[PDB]
Design a protein around this ligand. Structure first.
Ligand code: AMP
Ligand code: AMP
Ligand code: CA
Ligand code: CA
Ligand code: CA
Ligand code: CA
Ligand code: CA
Ligand code: CA
Ligand code: CA
Ligand code: CA
Ligand code: CA
Ligand code: CA
Ligand code: CA
Ligand code: CA
Ligand code: CA
Lengths: 294, 298
């Protein structure tokens, strides 16, 4: 099977205008009538008519500040930037783009995903991992330069796999983590280690978490996941129900095989039956859904 | 259209990484008695014997496993195996680096070395928290570094990069030459994944930047660890349109054209970047060569 829909946040991006990042002058010239998006500490943002709030940008400075991040151009040719800031409690702020991002258009969601991962990175990359030195933003916020050595540090996106193990027919593995509300299962996920391919990572993470041996590992799609800095790569793989479970790396409290039937009805639910699926914008939902209605 | 014919080098086997033991100091110490040791110089080079990475008896550097070492897992039989950085004599024995000699290694050895190489390099570049600045200390068989002030864990970094074959849906495909390569040397289009984009959007973005084409039907082919120093390469193909002219916007690309399967097959047979004619293909151990090859022979 294949994914039915492109997952939220993946539907192409903007004109990120790589060119201009290394061109301080052009940034300054376009800043006059630039746009500004603003994110609080928790990554919350404002929305209006299904669209991200874009202030007039000049109303915080003459020039673009160092702590800002240049996001690109929007249809028409107008620059757009992002800053970390407090937000006004007297607006409509979204606590989690993760749980509410379906309210936004594709463009706005792209802006926000970019802005959110970058700002979070800045907040976690003020020092070189190499020596310890302070670091300084540059190039529209797309690098941080070591203050001692001049060496560039770049935005960090950790790849993670998320997998649906199925039997090749009508059944599929879902699992629940230690502290999750009961009756709540989802796909198996794990970070890619150094020295392994995605395919090997899937097989490894599945074996660790539920003790199955899988084959026929196939990619379904991908999704930026700024919480704070993942990119999720979706897979499916064939397991064997006869092989018993085993919770070695005990991140998984409970797991079972579920029927297509069970999953379809669990998808419709969202306090009745034994399986319930958490309701987010995740590619996880799109994978489960694309399998269950093959 | 197509799938990869071969599993790309460095992906051909997974180790028994023995996740269990990393958080179990005792079991590490018990198996260290008859453990194996791989040793890498600063440049990631190692010694090999009969196409296999050299695994010393491990006790000959310690009573116990040192802090700077990295636990790689088990080998068939159940024997532990570790890796350390050390200076090695350039002159007493040949030192091989995976980048140019990975084809000479067996699959297991190549996996071990790729893991060991990316991890040790990471340690050398993660002695301080990026967050605050504090020293950091290896732990859990070297798979984390703990901040000394806060106790917060830092983890190994792998940067994803895409590499793409743009084809017309039939018999032609885009290849390009970077300004900083020799003059008859072409390959696929590549790029790092930026924050806030999916792989598919990255492919479309990087293709548009480098050669100014608009692509659709972006499909994954496979992946390959790329510890030079810390990438993972994700291979794709996409459909372009030959009638749309080229344009070298983000001028990393000096020249590019559409090539026939015929042309590419004969270019593959001539040689790669290391080895007459106007097209010659970089890629030996790269998934790039495997993608081009898998497309050109159907
Ligand atoms: N995580 C990253 N590591 C290295 N280079 C990166 C990364 N993310 C983006 N880049 C860009 O990749 C280019 C470096 O090319 P290269 O010399 O092949 O590493 C520059 O334009 C960087 O801004
Ligand atoms: N590369 C990584 N980046 C961030 N956290 C990681 C990484 N590798 C392992 N972890 C930690 O390991 C936990 C679960 O491991 P996993 O089974 O790989 O999902 C995560 O919640 C993280 O705290
Ligand atoms: Ca551009
Ligand atoms: Ca107010
Ligand atoms: Ca997990
Ligand atoms: Ca995860
Ligand atoms: Ca793991
Ligand atoms: Ca295990
Ligand atoms: Ca795990
Ligand atoms: Ca059952
Ligand atoms: Ca010499
Ligand atoms: Ca590039
Ligand atoms: Ca690259
Ligand atoms: Ca890039
Ligand atoms: Ca680029």
């Amino acid at each position: 099977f294949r994914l039915r829909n492109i997952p939220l946040l993946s539907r192409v991006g903007l004109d990120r205008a790589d060119e201009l990042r290394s061109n301080p002058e052009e940034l300054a010239k376009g800043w006059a009538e630039a746009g500004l998006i603003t994110l609080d500490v928790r990554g919350r943002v404002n929305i209006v008519d299904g669209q991200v709030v874009i202030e007039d940008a000049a109303r915080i400075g003459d020039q673009p500040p160092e702590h800002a991040v240049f996001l690109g151009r929007i249809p028409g040719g107008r620059h757009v930037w992002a800053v970390r800031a407090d937000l006004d409690e007297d607006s409509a702020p979204l606590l989690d783009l993760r749980r509410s991002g379906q309210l936004f258009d594709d463009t706005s969601a792209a802006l926000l995903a970019t802005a959110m991962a970058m700002l979070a990175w800045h907040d976690n990359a003020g020092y070189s991992p190499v020596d310890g030195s302070p670091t300084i933003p540059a190039k529209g916020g797309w690098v941080r330069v070591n203050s001692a050595t001049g060496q560039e540090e770049f935005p960090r996106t950790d790849p993670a796999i998320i997998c649906l193990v199925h039997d090749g027919g009508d059944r599929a593995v879902l699992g629940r983590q230690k502290f999750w509300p009961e009756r709540m299962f989802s796909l198996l996920a794990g970070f890619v280690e150094a020295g392994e391919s995605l395919e090997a990572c899937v097989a490894r993470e599945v074996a660790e978490e539920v003790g199955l041996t899988v084959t026929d590992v196939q990619y379904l799609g991908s999704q930026p996941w700024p919480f704070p800095r993942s990119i999720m790569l979706g897979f499916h793989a064939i397991g064997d129900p006869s092989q018993p479970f085993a919770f070695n790396d005990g991140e998984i409290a409970e797991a079972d095989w579920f029927t297509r039937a069970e999953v379809r009805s669990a998808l419709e639910a969202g306090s009745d039956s034994r399986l319930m699926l958490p309701g987010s914008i995740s590619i996880a939902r799109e994978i489960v859904e694309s399998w269950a209605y093959a």
